[PDB]
């Protein structure tokens, strides 16, 4: 029961029993917490509760020290000192932001704003608290029981009454009963088990609620600037392909950590892999939150780095299929590609943390705790999508509040900025450069004259809350007949239910804006589906239209974003 204060690091035995994470609070900070919040239970070796038999006084403000035991006003002996007095709570070794983090329900944007603008120790307390709150919320949903099996990819479900039903998308991964993880897509539903198993009627599925481990390491280590490249040995034979990044690679070796803002198709993975060719003897750990982000780094490394010095770290509880071309689980290899949650306890000369807009402060801290590195490089784009905040329902989360790295990129600017988009037709580059990049993103490609926009509100229907716009899909169908080259397009929308409908009607491969991030396609057909905060979100809009290498058709619901698209308008 001996530890350090979360607010001022002062030593104490005084924890808070009312906080879900039980934080240690010193005498002054414990007082300022109990006297300003509903939190009145204070912990130590023995709790601050009335020692009198059958007494339920647990409020520290109503308790006193009577010799060596604690009693309320009704049971205290004549010679007794109040536990709360002179701005302190009695304890051994004798805050407005801490209070708000400790007592919020995490459903408001303002809660995440505070969790990212607070001191470093409060950022870890907010991250631990938020994650535990998100996990305790998983218990609220209702069990789905297999009532009948139709085919190898379709079934019918029986839901638990009294408990709400979770949205059926690839975002929520169920746990079948321990017969492997399972996913669902919309009474006939589509079943996708991570393990091929003959779906048993009667067997139940439940959401994976995991124990939230405490955070020790900061989200960002303290910054260090050096006069020379430190612990890294550069080449004087750096391939012309990577010469554009030489000054930035040198910046990487001259700072403890560095941030790289790379808009879509500006060369983030090329920069990340080229850093290995610039410091050829450096041990590099390549990390990201998702298996897809890690796999995209493996694909680029397969092209430039020796396959014998690479290893893809895969957790024993293999959830989805990932990169098979490197030797699996050899932690000792020079190049290690691994998701944040599967990182081993190891050291590195450089740690590259990619798709940083998708990281949370919990992820930032975990990386600093498992990896001890000479240099840390954070690659991503605050103008792209953040990790979904399942508890957040009120207010919008701005990019400067996604995590510590994004906060820095949006306030002091990033250390490095990749300014030339090599992927997209100029119509798309010009639109997103003006929309989210302050006119600093330049187009390498010419205009393709294959970027179209149509303003069509259609009809909005809902599959629970996930939206569908059948008339917008009908407009796509009509366009496809007149433009058969577009037969090869990927259909993108902000909603899985819109995508399920488009899949059956158009036969195009489908992708939500959020699952399309990091991917690129020659042709993209995007239907906005609705005018909601979700479908009008400028970061989501940015990702959506920057997936296209050659052409894009945007069927829009919002006049604002439609007018901003620098595309040829279509009629019908």
Contacting positions for Zn ion (CB under 5 A): 5, 7-8, 10, 16, 18-19, 26, 29, 39, 50, 52, 55, 57, 72, 75, 102
CB of 7 or CB of 294, closer to Zn ion? 7
72 is in an annotated binding site: yes
- Nearest of 513, 549, 510 to residue 530 by alpha carbon: 513
Cβ 214 to Zn ion shortest distance, Å: 16
CB of 26 or CB of 296, closer to Zn ion? 26
Cβ 74 to Zn ion shortest distance, Å: 5
| Residue-wise DSSP of 44-92 | SSS-SS--STT-----GGGEEEETTEEEETTT--SS-EESEETTEE--T
Using DSSP bridges, classify how beta strands 335-339 and 310-312 pair: parallel, antiparallel or unpaired.
Answer: parallel
Distances (CA, A) of 187 to 157, 190, 502: 8, 10, 18
Helix axes 404-411, 361-370, angle to 10 degrees: 110
CB of 111 or CB of 363, closer to Zn ion? 111
142 is in an annotated binding site: no
Burial of 152 (0-12, 13-18, 19+ CB in 10 A): exposed
Residues 564 and 553: their CA atoms lie apart, in Å, by 14
CB of 19 or CB of 252, closer to Zn ion? 19
Residues 567 and 424: their CA atoms lie apart, in Å, by 13
266 is in an annotated binding site: yes
Cβ 26 to Zn ion shortest distance, Å: 3
Cβ 342 to Zn ion shortest distance, Å: 33
Quote the tokens at residue 219.
């989200």
5 is in an annotated binding site: yes
Q: Which residues pair with 363 in a beta bridge?
A: none
- Nearest of 202, 119, 115 to residue 157 by alpha carbon: 202
Residues 478 and 63: their CA atoms lie apart, in Å, by 75
Residue 138, classed as helix, strand or coil, is helix
84 is in an annotated binding site: no
Cβ 80 to Zn ion shortest distance, Å: 12
Distances (CA, A) of 164 to 122, 131, 142, 144, 399: 32, 20, 6, 11, 31
Quote the tokens at residue 226.
């050096």
CB of 77 or CB of 344, closer to Zn ion? 77
Q: Which residues pair with 237 in a beta bridge?
A: none
Cβ 50 to Zn ion shortest distance, Å: 3
CB of 52 or CB of 238, closer to Zn ion? 52
193 is in an annotated binding site: no
Tokens 């001191």 belong to residue: 119
CB of 102 or CB of 435, closer to Zn ion? 102
338 is in an annotated binding site: no
CB of 88 or CB of 235, closer to Zn ion? 88
Helix axes 120-137, 109-117, angle to 10 degrees: 150
123 is in an annotated binding site: no
Q: Which residues pair with 174 in a beta bridge?
A: 182, 207
Cβ 72 to Zn ion shortest distance, Å: 3
Residues 355 and 378: their CA atoms lie apart, in Å, by 8
Contact 428, 546 (CB under 8 A): yes
536 is in an annotated binding site: no
310 is in an annotated binding site: no
CB of 90 or CB of 279, closer to Zn ion? 90
Q: How many residues does the chain have?
A: 572
8 is in an annotated binding site: yes
Cβ 18 to Zn ion shortest distance, Å: 4
Cβ 70 to Zn ion shortest distance, Å: 9
104 is in an annotated binding site: no
Cβ 42 to Zn ion shortest distance, Å: 9
CB of 72 or CB of 424, closer to Zn ion? 72
Helix axes 361-370, 120-137, angle to 10 degrees: 110
Query: Residue ranges for the binding site for a ribonucleoside 5'-triphosphate?
Result: 262-269
Q: Which residues are annotated as a binding site?
A: 5, 8, 16, 19, 26, 29, 33, 39, 50, 55, 72, 75, 262-269
Known binding-site residues for Zn(2+) equal: 5, 8, 16, 19, 26, 29, 33, 39, 50, 55, 72, 75
């Amino acid at each position: 029961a001996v530890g350090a204060c979360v607010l001022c690091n002062s030593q104490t035995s005084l924890r808070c029993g009312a906080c879900i994470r039980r934080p240690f609070l010193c005498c002054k900070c414990c007082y300022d917490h109990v006297i300003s919040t509903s939190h009145k239970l204070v912990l130590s070796v023995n709790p601050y509760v009335c020692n009198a038999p059958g007494c339920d006084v647990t409020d520290v403000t109503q308790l006193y020290l009577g010799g060596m035991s604690y009693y309320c006003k009704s049971h205290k002996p004549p010679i007794s000192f109040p536990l709360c007095a002179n701005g302190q709570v009695f304890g051994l070794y004798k805050v407005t932001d801490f209070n708000a983090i400790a007592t919020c329900d995490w459903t408001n944007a303002g809660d995440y704003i505070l969790a990212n603008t607070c001191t470093e120790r409060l950022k870890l307390f907010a991250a631990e608290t938020l994650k535990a709150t998100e996990e305790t919320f998983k218990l609220s949903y209702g069990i789905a029981t297999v009532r009948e099996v139709l085919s190898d990819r379709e079934l019918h479900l029986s839901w638990e009454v009294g408990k709400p039903r979770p949205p059926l998308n690839r975002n929520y991964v169920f746990t079948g009963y321990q017969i492997g993880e399972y996913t669902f897509e919309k009474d006939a539903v589509v079943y996708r088990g991570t393990t091929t198993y003959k779906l048993n009627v009667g067997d139940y599925f439940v959401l994976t609620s995991h124990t939230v481990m405490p955070l020790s390491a900061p989200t960002l280590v303290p910054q260090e600037h050096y006069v020379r490249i430190t612990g890294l040995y550069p080449t004087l034979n750096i391939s012309d392909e990577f010469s554009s990044n030489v000054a930035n690679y040198q910046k990487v070796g001259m700072q403890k950590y560095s941030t790289l803002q790379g808009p879509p198709g500006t060369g983030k993975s090329h920069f990340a892999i080229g850093l290995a060719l610039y410091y050829p003897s450096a041990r590099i750990v390549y990390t990201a939150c998702s298996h897809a982000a890690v796999d995209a780094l493996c694909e680029k490394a397969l092209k430039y780095l020796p396959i014998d010095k690479c290893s893809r770290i895969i957790p024993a509880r293999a959830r989805v299929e990932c990169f098979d071309k490197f030797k699996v689980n050899s932690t000792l290899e020079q190049y290690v590609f691994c998701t944040v949650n599967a990182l081993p306890e190891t050291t590195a000369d450089i740690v590259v943390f990619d798709e940083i807009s998708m990281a949370t402060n919990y992820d930032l801290s975990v990386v600093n705790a498992r990896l001890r590195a000479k240099h840390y490089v954070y690659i991503g784009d605050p103008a792209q999508l953040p990790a979904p905040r399942t508890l957040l329902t009120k207010g919008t989360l701005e990019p400067e509040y996604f995590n510590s790295v994004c906060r820095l990129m949006k306030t002091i600017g990033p250390d490095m900025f990749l300014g030339t988009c090599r992927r997209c037709p100029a119509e798309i580059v010009d639109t997103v450069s003006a929309l989210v990049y302050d006119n600093k993103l330049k187009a390498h490609k010419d205009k393709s004259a294959q970027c179209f926009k149509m303003f069509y509100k259609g009809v909005i229907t809902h599959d629970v809350s996930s939206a569908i716009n059948r008339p917008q899909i009908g407009v796509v169908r009509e366009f496809l007949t007149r433009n058969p080259a577009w037969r090869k397009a990927v259909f993108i929308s902000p909603y899985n239910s819109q995508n399920a409908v488009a899949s059956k009607i158009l036969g195009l491969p489908t992708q939500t804006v959020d699952s399309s991030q990091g991917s690129e396609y020659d042709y993209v057909i995007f239907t906005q589906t609705t005018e909601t905060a979700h479908s009008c979100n400028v970061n989501r809009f940015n990702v959506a239209i920057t997936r296209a290498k050659v052409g894009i058709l945007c069927i829009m619901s919002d006049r604002d974003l439609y007018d901003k698209l620098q595309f040829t308008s279509l009629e019908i």
